[PDB]
């Protein structure tokens, strides 16, 4: 089963989900950094804007609907939604699950009035899950019916298909090469070993190691604000509040950037990180490359987005907890 999504201005990626009975449709990211599924609740207070602004799921509007309510709250990088726990059907790609989700009544104009999706679906393990709720991919692999435990995504670039996530397996059309697997460093995340980055002409990053978190959540490609300073300095680029930049007519110039995962050199190109809006010596340019101090236990980390899972189709293998890279298509 495979699930299309749209790509929204190379930073959102999001696929269709029916909950309930009649199905009742939600625009969702599919982020491997975190468990939980969650959206929009139609108890949400209209004060909040960002609820004004999405599709808003009406529990008494659903026969297949389940009552819990158990209060719970997501922490994510960029923002915090709270809300309480419901019951019911959900379809996703074709497949029909119970799913225990979160109905959010508390979601912030700031991050979520700049939403495209009404919320999330976690694609992460059971042991990241707020209130330890069965993550949706577990119920649908409790099913029996995918051929494999595992599944991939694929993100095109802006254009203007957005998109694509197979559950069961993965898509010989969006890949070529092989896959190339990394054993994750343990199950419960999807994290994995990264043996160095390098800039250029010189391996002035992550040198002993470091972790990197593959996640498909993740808009970009980040890293804690001690490594990117460093990666940003040797790119020129100049700081500013939410993000770095370059002047325009260097954005091409910008060298190479690697990521050493598994025995394999994973590079970037300034095609590939920086948003090329013009060429212009008076404009500023920004890069798909933020700083993101991620806590613990999960982080410090790396985390490895959008910007270069469009490089890079990706497999997430449950079976054998592994990640595998492949050239995208």
Same mark, same amino acid.
């Given at each position: 089963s495979s699930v299309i999504l749209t790509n929204y201005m190379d930073t959102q990626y999001y696929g269709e989900i029916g909950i309930g009975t009649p199905p009742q449709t939600f625009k969702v990211v599919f982020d491997t950094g975190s468990s939980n599924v969650w959206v929009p609740s139609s108890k949400c207070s209209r004060l909040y804007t960002a609820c004004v602004y999405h599709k808003l799921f009406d529990a008494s509007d659903s026969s297949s609907y389940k009552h819990n309510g158990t209060e719970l709250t997501l922490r994510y990088s960029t923002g915090t939604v709270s809300g309480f726990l419901s019951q019911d059907i959900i379809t996703v790609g074709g497949i029909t699950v119970t799913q225990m989700f979160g109905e959010v009544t508390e979601m912030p104009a700031l991050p979520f009035m700049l939403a495209e999706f009404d919320g999330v679906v976690g694609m992460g393990f059971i042991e990241?899950?707020?209130?330890?709720?069965?993550?949706?991919?577990?119920?649908?692999?409790? *099913?029996?019916?995918? /051929?494999?435990?595992?599944?991939?995504?694929?993100?095109?670039?802006?254009?203007?298909l957005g998109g694509q996530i197979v559950l069961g397996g993965s898509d010989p059309q969006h890949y070529e090469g092989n896959f190339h697997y990394i054993?994750?460093?343990?199950?419960?995340?999807? *994290?994995?070993?990264? /043996?160095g980055v390098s800039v250029g002409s010189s391996t002035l990053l992550c040198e002993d190691g470091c972790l990197a978190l593959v996640d498909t959540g993740a808009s970009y490609i980040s890293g804690s604000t001690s490594s990117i300073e460093k990666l940003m300095e040797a790119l020129g680029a100049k700081k500013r509040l939410f993000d770095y930049v370059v002047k325009c007519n260097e954005g091409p110039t910008l060298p190479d950037i690697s990521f050493h995962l598994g025995g394999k050199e994973y590079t970037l190109t300034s095609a590939d990180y920086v948003f090329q809006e013009s060429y212009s010596s008076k404009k500023l340019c920004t890069l798909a490359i933020h700083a993101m101090d991620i806590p613990p236990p999960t982080g410090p980390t790396w985390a490895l987005g959008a910007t270069f899972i469009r490089k890079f189709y990706t497999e997430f293998d449950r079976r054998n907890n592994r990640?595998?890279?492949?050239?995208?298509?």
């Open positions: 990241q899950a707020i209130g330890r709720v069965t993550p949706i991919f577990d119920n649908i692999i409790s *099913q029996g019916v995918l /051929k494999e435990d595992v599944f991939s995504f694929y993100y095109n670039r802006d254009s203007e054993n994750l460093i343990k199950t419960g995340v999807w *994290q994995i070993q990264m /043996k990640i595998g890279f492949a050239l995208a298509r």
